[PDB]
């Protein structure tokens, strides 16, 4: 409150000989943002509410959630196999591992399936492992001191077995690691001396899991309890939420084969098709500048810095495209994959960094 701060060194050089505005300190503009908000490239070209949206959505993204995941038994944790450095990176990626892919996005109307915050995804992109990983759940079943024990129950001397369940999968009280558990299967055997009552554990989930790792550790009171780790093979599928670093989140609505996706004259085809109508009200301009910059980065072979509050010139960034052999607008002659007919309009297509938000449709 005793400080008069020049908001940048440009402002300080502007008032270098100005005796009527004497600054006490000079600021570095990027210092006004957190680390999550510094992920977003050209964040001052976006309306700031969407920067808030991204700061909410950046932490929600899947990726390499830890480097010790095989040594953990976690609940609802997602490990994504493939991750990429953005073609237009910011300073925040000097300190956090990026969790996303440089998807080729076409900004176009294609059949009406990306209307209102939906995207059309390439089924081939999904099959190859785009945003694919593994999902982990944990279970913790305890015993009583000499009243309860682990073991494959017998229907003759144990009462109140769970109706219509499968008890065969148990070996020495547990299903072996590496087998598929189904809806209704018994996953931990448990008998209780009173003759017996069946306090077994059943797998009540819609999608089958696989026993990843099972262990018999000791609790705080030095008692053996059952610990099961369940893994899920999670591809991207219809209903999963993606998002760019500008906060434009959307649900995968359709997945097309390779031969149904649009393709340019050079054979470039998108991974995502996002609606152009998501832009004008949201005013997420940093996503469009990122595609323009990242389109020439890929051909040049470089990764550039798109941190917020750096000097930018979209006119010169568009001329960088024309010098790399593309059009000034970054648009290309594109063909309809279903009919083979060219659109009467160049389509804006290029690499935009996208993320998978950890809202799985199968969980909801």
């Amino acid at each position: 409150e005793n400080c008069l701060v020049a908001f940048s060194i440009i402002e300080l050089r502007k008032h270098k000989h100005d005796v009527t505005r004497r600054f006490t300190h000079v600021d570095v503009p990027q210092a006004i943002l957190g680390l999550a908000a510094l992920v977003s490239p050209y964040a001052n070209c976006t309306q700031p509410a969407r920067v808030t949206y991204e700061t909410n959505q950046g932490r929600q993204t899947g990726g390499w959630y830890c480097f010790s995941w095989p040594y953990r038994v976690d609940m609802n944790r997602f490990f994504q196999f493939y991750n990429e450095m953005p073609l237009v990176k910011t300073i925040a990626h000097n300190y956090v591992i990026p969790n996303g892919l440089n998807t080729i996005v076409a900004y176009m109307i294609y059949g009406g399936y990306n209307q209102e915050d939906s995207v059309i995804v390439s089924q081939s992109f999904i099959d190859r492992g785009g945003f694919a990983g593994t999902f982990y759940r944990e279970e913790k079943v305890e015993l009583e001191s000499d009243i309860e024990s682990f073991g494959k129950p017998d229907p003759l001397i144990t009462k109140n077995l769970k109706p219509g369940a499968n008890y065969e999968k148990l070996v020495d009280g547990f299903v072996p690691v590496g087998t598929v558990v189904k809806k209704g299967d018994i996953i931990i055997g448990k008998v209780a001396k009173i003759k017996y009552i069946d306090r077994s554990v059943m797998y009540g989930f819609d999608e089958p899991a696989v026993v990843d790792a099972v262990m018999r550790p000791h609790g705080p009171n030095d008692e053996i309890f059952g610990l099961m780790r369940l893994r899920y093979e999670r591809n991207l599928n219809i209903g999963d939420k993606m998002s760019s670093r500008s906060g434009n989140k959307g649900i995968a609505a359709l997945a097309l084969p390779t031969s149904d996706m649009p393709f340019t004259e050079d054979g470039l085809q998108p991974d995502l098709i996002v609606n152009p109508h998501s832009h004008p009200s949201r005013m997420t301009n940093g996503q469009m500048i990122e595609t323009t910059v990242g389109l020439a980065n890929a051909l040049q072979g470089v990764v550039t810095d798109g941190t917020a509050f750096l000097p930018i010139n979209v006119q010169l960034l568009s001329e960088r495209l024309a010098q790399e052999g593309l059009r000034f607008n970054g648009c290309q002659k594109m063909f309809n994959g279903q009919t083979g007919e060219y659109f009467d309009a160049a389509i804006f297509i290029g690499p935009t960094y996208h993320q998978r938000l950890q809202k799985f449709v199968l969980d909801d």
């Binding site: 500048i289 648009c331 160049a346």
Partner: protein
Amino acid sequence: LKMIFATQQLALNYVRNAGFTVSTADMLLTPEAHQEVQEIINELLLESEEINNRLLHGDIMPPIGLTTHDFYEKLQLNALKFPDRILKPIMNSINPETNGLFQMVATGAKGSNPNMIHIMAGIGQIEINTQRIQPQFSFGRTLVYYPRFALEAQAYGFICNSYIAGLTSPEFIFGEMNGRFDLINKALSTSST
């Protein structure tokens, strides 16, 4: 309802042969049209400076009912409004027959004219509760970047930059203040009603 679906398919089957896109170059002004916007904004700031020089000489007399503070801010709020001619340099840069940002706005599919002006030409004055940015940083400062009792229009939320040009730190903060208000009021949307 049967005709909404049927005309929807004619519309969608046309575009699957005509194409529709928006690019970064749809939001970019010509260098000649960039100078026209800067001229218009300097006129806004020159008329804002004329009021301040009247404040310096004590030449601002309010009407019967208003104080000097509330009459000074009303004069500033109206002197920092974008003229209708701001769309001359925007419409000079674009081709309405091909520009996809314009056609979404012009046909009522999505967006509005202030959205196009904010992206392409300039954002202008931030109004919160139909009022400028009130000094809440210790008695006559709006931010740590501006001196106490600053008279420039930038000190109270006038953004001279468009989104496509990139805001600065004070302009980003003022726009952040404006955006956070709308989130809070939208949070009162659920509870109050």
